[PDB]
Every structure is written in structure tokens, then in C-alpha cells.
Amino acid sequence: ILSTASVLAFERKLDPSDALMSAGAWAQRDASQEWPAVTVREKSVQTVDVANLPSDADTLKVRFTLRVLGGAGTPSACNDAAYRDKLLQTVATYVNDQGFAELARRYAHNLANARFLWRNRVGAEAVEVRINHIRQGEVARAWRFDALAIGLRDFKADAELDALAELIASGLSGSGHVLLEVVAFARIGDGQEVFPSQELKSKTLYSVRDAAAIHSQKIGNALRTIDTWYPDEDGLGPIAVEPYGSVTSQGKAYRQPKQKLDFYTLLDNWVLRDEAPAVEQQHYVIANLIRGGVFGEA
């Protein structure tokens, strides 16, 4: 009868690292290997942790690595073997009909425009993202983007965005080891406040070794913000690919299960009863398989 398996743990493809933030000056972005890190200093108001740049530094270098893994629809844990074979046939049908060429294009956009710079991007005079394909320890292929000319809203075609799209496609399919070093320089201003990720002394900021950083899951949420195929009212742009695709800023779950557009109903219609959804919603379902998670009932 092919019920859904009681466990489905998918591992996370598109593994980012913690995004270390350093500080320095614009017009020496190319010499940004010995830049002093941004330190989380405690100030007294209550005691808050606050991170700024130094008073002679106007450029925030946020640097992290990204592993695009591959083998998306293959689960890491699955009870029913028949369900696993049917799900793998469905995912292989998707990749053979249309490979990771829309998904990796949108992920390459979210690398190119610095959405991973979350609140450090909103009033930045110039953002510039460098993505280096690191193969055997050196740069096999280097990109250099203007993260403000590439918007956060629209997915525009380019020439180097397409090359990064085929790179993340080959990494996402399984035909190559893709590791990218993503460096982004936010020209905020001299000594302006930077916004690292935040812990749970009313405010604690996340730092690894006396150096501020954004969490890896915040960077990964900013990469997954590709879902435009949801029922779009109100003028909201792309949202993060979540099951019951929800935003906490608005308190509203788009793709509610009362419509047939959440990940679970689309997946159970796609693999069990062969009701293949549209190209857009199946892009979204494969994006939730790349996102990973614990699917399956209890």
C-alpha cells in the first residue's frame, strides 16, 4: 500500500560553517587575510554584549566555507525499504528530467547577494562577495560579485552566476566535490555596529575564539531563502524553504496544510500516489530534501 516510512532523517546538504567576522578598510579587500577580528565587548547600560568595528575600520569581512554535498533524496534513516526505493525513484526522476539547475541557481544567488550578511547588509554602502572554489587547497575558480547590484528579491540571470550555478549543480548531483570559500565585505562605516548572532546579562553575542561570528544555521537559512513558489500575497519576496513554509517575523505560516502546498502533502502525493506536483512545488520539495530534516510520522 506504500505508507510513508516511520523514520525519515535526511542529512543536510549545503553545509556552511560559522561565519567569522573581521574588520578592516575598504580598498584593501584583497589584503584581507591579516585583518583584526571583530571582538564582542561588554558595555554597561544592565550589561549587554555589543560588537562594533574599530574606529579606523569601515569594512566588515564575513568569511565562511560551504560544502555542497550531493545525494539529496537519499535518506540517512528510513524504516520502509519500499518507500525508500520509491522516493529514490521519484528524486531520480526529478534529477533526470530537470537537474539541480533552478535550485543551485537560487542558492548561487543567495551566495552572490550577501543575504548571509543578515543585518549587516541593510544600510551598507557597498557589499562585495568573493566565492572561491577551493580544490586541493587553492582557488580552482574565483568569483567576485556585487551583492547590491544582485538584489535580494529577484533572481536575475548572469554569466558568472550561471557558472556558480553549474558548480553547485555538480556538487548537488554528486559529480564533484564542491567546497566554496565565501568572503563578503560590508562597507558599513567607521566604527559602526555589526550584528553577530545572538545567544541565550540581557544580551550575549556569539563568538568562537575572541572573534564575533554568525551561526552556521543563520547563514544556512539565508542560503535557503529561495522559496518564491508559495501563494504570494502582500508583496513578500523569497522565504526560507521550510515545511509549512513559515516566517517568524510575520507570525504566519505560508504553505499551510489547508492548502495542498506544504512539503508533507506534496511529498506524500508525489511518491505514494504518483500525483506529481508542478515544477515549482517539486523544486520546493527537493529543496526541503537538500535542507534535511526529520520527516516521517510517529
Partner: protein
Amino acid sequence: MDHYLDIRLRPDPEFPPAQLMSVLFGKLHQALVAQGGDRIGVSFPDLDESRSRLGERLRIHASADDLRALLARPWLEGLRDHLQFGEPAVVPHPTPYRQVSRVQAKSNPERLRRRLMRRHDLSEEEARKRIPDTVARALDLPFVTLRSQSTGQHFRLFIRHGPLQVTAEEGGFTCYGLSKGGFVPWF
């Protein structure tokens, strides 16, 4: 000031409208110190006075050449993915006028204590005697949370909309777009 330009916040999955209004008001403040003059005024046409929320629209009242200078200035670089602009358009008539003023409060007694110990050479206990803890009055007002570049402090800039009028009176505007006496059309 018969021309206006409404700047509506787009909704965003990442940021609330209050924070984007704060960033837009700060960038507007830098753009108005950069441009100079006193003929640039603001309004908040989606104001909710009951909940003290500034809304999701910011209207800029100015001359024609000032708005055509402001629309091509790079103060909106980095903000354009969160806003949408109209055009510089002429205002309707008849339109009521109200004053948009910066209202500050003495919400910290310790700073007044530092001022009185600096101004009358008093002690801590004499200043605390003259200034109790009941003088800390909070405002029931909407606000933007700004940060300064001269100093390094984060301040809440509370904005109050005045009572409606049938005519406007002459006067200038501050470099935050708010009023030092001038009036803006409300519609």
C-alpha cells in the same frame, strides 16, 4: 512644499518594519545632513496612534529639485531591496496640516543627577534628594531607534504628530526631517 514622495516598506521575512523604518530614518538623517537646508519634511501616513506604531510608509515633503536630487543620491543603496518608491508627485488640496516634532523625555534621573552635580557642585545624596525616581516619565509615542556617529550611543527618537490645522505656518525643519516649527500636508 507642494511635492511629496512616499517610501513604503516592503514586508520582509528577515526584518520587522520597525527596524527597517529605523534604518531608513537613519539613512535619511545622513542624507539630510549631506544635502543641507531646512526645506525637507517627513510624515508617517500609516500612523496608528492607538498602538503607537509608525506604520509602513514614510512620506518626504520638499521642493521638486530637492526630491530629484534625493532620488538619485546613493543614500538608498542597500535599502532598495526593502523599499519601493513612487514618483515626486504634487499634493492634493484641501489637505489638513500637522506638526511632526521630536519629543524627548527625562526618562533617566541619573543623567539629571550628573547635570546638577556638574552645575551646582552638589553631592550624590543631595542630587538624589532633589531629583527623586518619580521624575522618570516615559512617552506613549511611536519612535525610531537610531545610533549616532558623533558619539556612539543608541537613542530612541520619539515622533509626535501634532493636531490637524487648516493652514500652514512658515518655518524650517530639522536634519532628521522633523519640524522645528514648520508644517507638512497630511493626507
